[PDB]
């Protein structure tokens, strides 16, 4: 069952809409969905004030597909803590897309702001454009971050992707800036493009794979040699990779960084 949200003009003061999720839409009529509360800065407003609503209701969230038929560049927390069903955004989203989600799937056809999939527990997020900082990160002060789910970004991402990661998987098909996998404990990060610096900084566990060039790396890592045609958590990666263990600035560190031999000769000692 498809429920269509057609955005009216997005406001300059952003909207916060954590109630845009199949779990809230389940069991509500089209008229009840228009009355769902969202924030517009320091005022509470109705979903209907900023979106046209149409389609067919459904009683269970697993049978709901929300289609946002337009750009929602100034709408935060879409799909926050969703457990089932699907959201497709035919445009951009602001921060916190799918933050804390437990299941289901979110597809963003455009770009996403920072904290996409922050604290993710399960399900899937797919961003066809670029993402901001803190893809699949933890919250300020907490030492327990993302514990499951898959995040795929087809474009580029910025800093601290997988910050304090404790499970799940992050795939960046483009490039990243600095500190991917900062304080990582567990999980898998695959960067198909390049890294500027500090991959795996202060990591204690988990695996980071860089298929492109790492411009700079870290002296706290131990070089283990080359591995070929590697397989990590079911992902088959053909070719040769320089293998490093660290970050030994951390006590008892067991993290692994794989970097493609072809463009990382300057990183190997």
């Amino acid at each position: 069952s498809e429920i269509i949200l057609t955005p009216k003009e997005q406001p300059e003061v952003p909207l916060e809409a954590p109630n845009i999720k199949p779990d809230v839409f389940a069991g509500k009529s089209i008229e009840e969905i228009k009355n769902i509360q969202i924030m517009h800065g320091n005022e509470v407003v109705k979903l209907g004030d900023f979106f046209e609503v149409s389609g067919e209701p459904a009683d269970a969230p697993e049978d709901i597909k929300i289609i946002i038929d337009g750009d929602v560049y100034n709408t935060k927390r879409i799909g926050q803590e969703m457990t089932a069903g699907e959201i497709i955004v035919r445009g951009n989203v602001n921060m916190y897309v799918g933050a804390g989600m437990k299941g289901g799937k979110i597809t963003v056809e455009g770009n996403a702001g920072s904290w996409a999939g922050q604290d993710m527990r399960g399900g899937e997020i797919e961003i066809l454009g670029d993402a901001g900082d803190y893809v699949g990160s933890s919250y300020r002060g907490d030492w327990r971050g993302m514990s499951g789910g898959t995040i795929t970004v087809h474009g580029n991402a910025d800093n601290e992707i997988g910050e304090y990661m404790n499970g799940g998987k992050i795939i960046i098909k483009g490039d990243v800036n600095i500190m991917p996998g900062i304080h990582m404990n567990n999980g898998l990060i695959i960067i198909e493009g390049n890294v500027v610096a500090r991959a795996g900084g202060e990591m204690a566990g988990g695996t980071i794979v860089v298929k492109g060039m790492m411009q700079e790396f870290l002296a706290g890592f131990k070089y283990l040699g080359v591995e070929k045609d590697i397989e990590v958590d079911g992902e088959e990666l053909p070719g040769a990779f320089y293998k490093f263990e660290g970050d030994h600035a951390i006590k008892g560190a067991k993290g692994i960084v794989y970097a493609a031999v072809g463009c990382n000769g300057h990183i190997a000692p």
Partner: protein, 329 residues
Amino acid sequence: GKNITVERTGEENRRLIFQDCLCAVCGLCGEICPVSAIEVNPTGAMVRTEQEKSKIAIDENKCVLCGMCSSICPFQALDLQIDGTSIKELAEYPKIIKSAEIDDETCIQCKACETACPQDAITITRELPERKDLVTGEIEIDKDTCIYCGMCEEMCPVDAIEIDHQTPSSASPVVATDIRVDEDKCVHCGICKRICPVDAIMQVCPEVTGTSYIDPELCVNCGWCQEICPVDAATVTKPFEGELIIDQDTCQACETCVMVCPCNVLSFPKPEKPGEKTTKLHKDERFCIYCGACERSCPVTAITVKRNRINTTPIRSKAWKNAFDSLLK
């Protein structure tokens, strides 16, 4: 920038990708194309000079995405994909039989093949044993007998001895506060015990692992690894069989073919002694793949390539059989 993609969508999607960086400008794709859709630029010019153009041009109005050019290319520069899968994984498409492999159990990680490979397709690594495991002995300095003369520290060939030197003060009226031997660095040569003027020193006297990897996209099946290997761990099979013929008198030693050859077959030997004469253009066909780039590059046609066989199982399609047979000479 320099790569070319010819694509056609529909019921069945077909996509031909050309990678300029892998192209050796041999001309075989242009020769095989049954509709003459490809124009290959001059071999010498594309290798020896700076050019903004791609090495080949594919006419979209003539190409029918048959895949013959992708199949023949000895350099993996042309790849035809049908519904996302490469023709090299589809048994319906004729495939040239070739290979290059290293037996990991036989290999001793000597790195000679890595150095010899003309395409830099090989990665050889090795984990050497730690220095301490290649020497055996015991060493001890009596710090009460030691007078801190510094002769052992100076003479030690590996800097294993360290003295904590200092300028004396009235609170610490000594020239040094400690002396230590780093047993992980010591090679048990016995120099320190022999130079000590007060006999303060007592001194008395793991297999190589690694990884071997051949990149299948860069490898051109030249056979340099197989020939150079001291233990016969590397095995190579070639796509074509043929012959090279050089006319030494026609050759004017411009060096174009030498620079063009992607398999390092051709060279200009240097005379060993003054007044000795050498072969103007030297070949070693053990490394040749009969690609034809050398002949194509030569402006005076002093070097020619004959191709006697293209290694495949019997070709079923008459169009493909006729195209492959046109490359034999």
